[PDB]
């Protein structure tokens, strides 16, 4: 999930936008 | 500000800033 | 910290702190 | 919603917990 993708590895705008409503 | 390791309040802040008026969901588990 | 007016990053922070490992949803609209 | 209840008026733990997953 987000923690694995953005905390334990480098985040990206592409990934973050997947969590906007 | 998004292309780094973002954890805890730092990640939530990034979501806040990116998502704007859409809002977001933070699901750490 | 919760029994006040909480807006923007302040509200998101409160949700972060209260909700913990559950996470939360922020839906301003 | 949350903005009306917690920003434009005084928030509460009861209200905030309704937005946890």
From Swiss-Prot, chains A, D:
This is Insulin A chain. The chain holds residues 90 to 110 of 110 of the full protein. It comes from Homo sapiens. Disulfide bonds join 6-11. It comes from the Eukaryota.
């Amino acid at each position: 999930g987000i923690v694995e993708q953005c905390c334990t590895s480098i985040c990206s705008l592409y990934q973050l936008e997947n969590y906007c409503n | 500000f998004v292309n780094q390791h973002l954890c805890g309040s730092h990640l939530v802040e990034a979501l806040y800033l990116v998502c704007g008026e859409r809002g977001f969901f933070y699901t750490p588990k």
